[PDB]
Amino acid sequence: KTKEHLMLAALETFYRKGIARTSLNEIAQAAGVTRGALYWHFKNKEDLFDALFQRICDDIENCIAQDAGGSWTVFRHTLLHFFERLQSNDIHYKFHNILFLKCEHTEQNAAVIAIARKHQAIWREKITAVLTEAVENQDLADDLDKETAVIFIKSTLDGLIWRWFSSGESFDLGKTAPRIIGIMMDNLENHPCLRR
Amino acid sequence: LKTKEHLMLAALETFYRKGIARTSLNEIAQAAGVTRGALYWHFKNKEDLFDALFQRICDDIENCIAQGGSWTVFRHTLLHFFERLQSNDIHYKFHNILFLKCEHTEQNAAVIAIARKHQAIWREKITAVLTEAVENQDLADDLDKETAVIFIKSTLDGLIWRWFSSGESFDLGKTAPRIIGIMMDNLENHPCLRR
Numbered sequence A: 001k002t003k004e005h006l007m008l009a010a011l012e013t014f015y016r017k018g019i020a021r022t023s024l025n026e027i028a029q030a031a032g033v034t035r036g037a038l039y040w041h042f043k044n045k046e047d048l049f050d051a052l053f054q055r056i057c058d059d060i061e062n063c064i065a066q067d068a069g070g071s072w073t074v075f076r077h078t079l080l081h082f083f084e085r086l087q088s089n090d091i092h093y094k095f096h097n098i099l100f101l102k103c104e105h106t107e108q109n110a111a112v113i114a115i116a117r118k119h120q121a122i123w124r125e126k127i128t129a130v131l132t133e134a135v136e137n138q139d140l141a142d143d144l145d146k147e148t149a150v151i152f153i154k155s156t157l158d159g160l161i162w163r164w165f166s167s168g169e170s171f172d173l174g175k176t177a178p179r180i181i182g183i184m185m186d187n188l189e190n191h192p193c194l195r196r
Numbered sequence B: 001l002k003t004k005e006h007l008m009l010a011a012l013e014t015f016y017r018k019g020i021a022r023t024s025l026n027e028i029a030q031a032a033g034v035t036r037g038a039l040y041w042h043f044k045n046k047e048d049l050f051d052a053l054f055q056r057i058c059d060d061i062e063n064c065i066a067q068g069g070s071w072t073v074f075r076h077t078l079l080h081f082f083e084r085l086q087s088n089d090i091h092y093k094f095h096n097i098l099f100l101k102c103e104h105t106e107q108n109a110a111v112i113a114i115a116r117k118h119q120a121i122w123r124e125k126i127t128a129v130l131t132e133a134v135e136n137q138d139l140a141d142d143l144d145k146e147t148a149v150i151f152i153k154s155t156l157d158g159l160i161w162r163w164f165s166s167g168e169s170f171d172l173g174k175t176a177p178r179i180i181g182i183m184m185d186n187l188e189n190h191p192c193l194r195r
């Protein structure tokens, strides 16, 4: 509860001031913990961020058993569960808020950004594996262009998150995300321009 | 009106290298090789430079429309917008700043409000293209236009965001037309965008 208390203080501070303008010492103030104890648990600020990203991912994967007839069906559930969690889980809300809006791509953030890309590369391969299992079960056609489909998926879903935050949550994500996900899946299943 | 454009581009250039939050007027005026006062005459603050930059992006897009049916004109304008992102350094840098170097902190609050104003304008313009397209029967009378405009913007936002934040990992020239085609098809045919 010491290591956790520090990450939530990192998250709360990142959300307030942004990643670049946040210091390993002002995180200590929020957590109310000596810097040597902080250094005990994490080397530097990228570490706090890497742990926040890992917690987000753990939460998604831990629920996948509870989301799970067939794996392409599980994907649908996991996508829908993701967007509900954005609304109702304050940790996932703030973290994605930070990732899309509070993490500017300047040299000051270079190390944090490389951490983001490590986790996104893991997610990119998660998608490929799901597409691959789905072709094998014949939920997707055998000539599905998997490299293109992966860009299409990340593009479609990133766009909805970006739009939602940028608008200031000015539309109902609970009604809109299922429409968007519905259209996307239909396109992966049926549209010719995602075939090789 | 040519002094204004030189001050504007020094800001765009400085915003691109440092981001908006860390740029100061001093550095802009320096980059432009003019005094603080002379900059101040044309532009009071960074908000006003960013606003003018955003205004010039929109002017470029609108001027090229002026040179089929409007629903066909829309498709062409989406396609050319993404070509322009590759081949036009000002549209590249600007959208790079808007999506990657425009943090949503309190110091940037005024710039963000600027950005929302222009995004609102574009939303109204998209809403009109959909309204005209319906009456010309390029889209169905039953088209859910409120959802459709969210759908169009997040489709395009997603491409731009994904291309910039991945370090331009894929070829926008092959990807953008394929995304825009699929979008166009869904607007015309997908039943999720109706009723």
Ligand SMILES: C[C@]12CC[C@@H]3c4ccc(O)cc4CC[C@H]3[C@@H]1CC[C@@H]2O
Pocket: A060, A075, A078, A079, A082, A123, A124, A126, A127, A130, A153, A154, A157, A158
């Ligand atoms: C699509 C995203 C990457 C891939 C993620 C994934 C990847 C595999 C999987 O089985 C489920 C999910 C759900 C959340 C998805 C993410 C939501 C937004 C992000 O871009």
Ligand SMILES: C[C@]12CC[C@@H]3c4ccc(O)cc4CC[C@H]3[C@@H]1CC[C@@H]2O
Pocket: B061, B074, B077, B078, B081, B122, B123, B125, B126, B129, B152, B153, B156, B157
């Ligand atoms: C979707 C955007 C706003 C609406 C823009 C528009 C709005 C109306 C129109 O007739 C054409 C275009 C092309 C470019 C579009 C933009 C590309 C990026 C921007 O977010």
